[PDB]
Write a protein that binds this ligand. Structure first.
Ligand SMILES: *[C@@H]1O[C@H](CO)[C@@H](O[C@@H]2O[C@H](CO)[C@@H](O)[C@H](O)[C@H]2NC(C)=O)[C@H](O)[C@H]1NC(C)=O
Lengths: 196, 65
C-alpha cells in the first residue's frame, strides 16, 4: 500500500469535538509519515508514551486510533495514565498501560473568538469515574443531593456538563489547547497501518 | 442557609444554563447567560469580600427549592 494516512485531515479540522464526546477516528490501510508533525506545528507537546518518536517513525504499527478534543492549557497535564483530575476522571481516561502518543498545542487564534467562544464543552458532575478508553455522552441531570428532580433545578441536581468561555484576553493557562491522542498496539500481527 | 450556599447554587444553575445554551448552538442566549454568570461571580466575590449582597439588582432566580 502507498496511499498516505489522513493525519493532515485530523490535524487540520476546522473544529474539534468536545472532550466529553471526544471524536474517535480509525486510521488503517495507509502509510503513516509522522515527520509532518515534527517539520510543521512550530509549537507542540509531542511527549509520547511507550515508544520513542524517531523509533516511532521507524517501526510498523497495526492499529492507530486518533482521539481529538480541546483542553485548557493549565489542565493539559491531566492526559496521562494513572493521573487524576476532573478531565481524567470525567471526560477522557487513559489506561494505566498505554502505548501511544499525545500532541497538544495552543489554539487561541483558531478557537477563541474576540467576543468569546462557547462551542467546547466538558463534564464536571457524575456518579462514578470513567473507565479507561470509554466515552460518556449522556446529559442526564446529576443526582448530587438526596432529592430526585428529573429536571434541571436550583437545588443539588445541576447540569452534568460545563461550557468553556475561551477568550483571547485570557492568559496562556486558560487558553484553549488542541489535544490529539494517538493509540498504538505493536503486536503487528495484521500490520494494516504500517509506516514507510 | 444565609447567602453563600444560595449564591453558589444560582452560580451552578446558570453555569448549567450556559452549557445547555452552548449545546443547543444558540449564540445570543449563550452570550446573555454568560453575562448573567459574570454579574453573579462579581456579586459572590463582593459578598466574600464582605460587601452587602443585593436582591433586585441581580436577576431573579428560577423556582429554587
Ligand atoms: C494542514 O496540514 C498540513 C500538514 O499537516 C500543513 O499544510 C502544509 O503542509 C505542507 C507539507 O505537506 C507544508 O510544506 C506547508 O508549509 C503547510 N502549510 C503551511 C501554511 O504551513 C498545515 O499544518 C495545515 N495547513 C494550515 C493552513 O495550517
Amino acid at each position: 500500500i502507498t496511499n498516505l494516512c489522513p493525519f493532515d485531515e485530523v490535524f487540520n479540522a476546522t473544529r474539534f469535538a468536545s472532550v466529553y464526546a471526544w471524536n474517535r477516528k480509525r486510521i488503517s490501510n495507509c502509510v503513516a509519515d509522522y515527520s509532518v508533525l515534527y517539520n510543521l506545528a512550530p509549537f507542540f507537546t509531542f511527549k509520547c508514551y511507550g515508544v520513542s518518536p524517531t523509533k516511532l517513525n521507524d517501526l510498523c504499527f497495526t492499529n492507530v486510533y486518533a482521539d481529538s478534543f480541546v483542553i485548557r492549557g493549565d489542565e493539559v497535564r491531566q492526559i496521562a495514565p494513572g493521573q487524576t483530575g476532573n478531565i481524567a476522571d470525567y471526560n477522557y481516561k487513559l489506561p494505566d498501560d498505554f502505548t501511544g502518543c499525545v500532541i497538544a498545542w495552543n489554539s487561541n487564534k483558531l478557537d477563541s473568538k474576540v467576543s468569546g467562544n462557547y462551542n467546547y464543552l466538558y463534564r464536571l458532575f457524575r456518579k462514578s469515574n470513567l473507565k479507561p478508553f470509554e466515552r460518556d455522552i449522556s446529559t442526564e441531570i446529576y443526582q448530587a443531593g438526596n432529592k430526585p428532580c428529573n429536571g434541571v433545578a436550583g437545588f443539588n441536581c445541576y447540569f452534568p456538563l460545563r461550557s468553556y468561555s475561551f477568550r483571547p484576553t485570557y492568559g496562556v493557562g486558560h487558553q484553549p489547547y488542541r489535544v490529539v491522542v494517538l493509540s498504538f498496539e505493536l503486536l503487528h500481527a495484521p500490520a494494516t497501518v504500517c509506516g514507510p | 442557609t444565609n447567602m453563600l450556599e444560595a449564591l453558589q447554587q444560582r452560580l451552578q444553575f446558570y453555569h448549567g444554563q450556559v452549557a445547555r445554551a452552548a449545546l443547543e448552538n444558540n449564540s445570543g442566549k449563550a452570550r446573555r447567560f454568560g453575562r448573567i454568570v459574570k454579574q453573579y461571580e462579581d456579586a459572590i466575590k463582593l459578598y466574600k469580600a464582605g460587601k452587602p449582597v443585593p436582591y433586585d439588582e441581580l436577576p431573579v432566580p428560577p423556582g429554587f427549592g
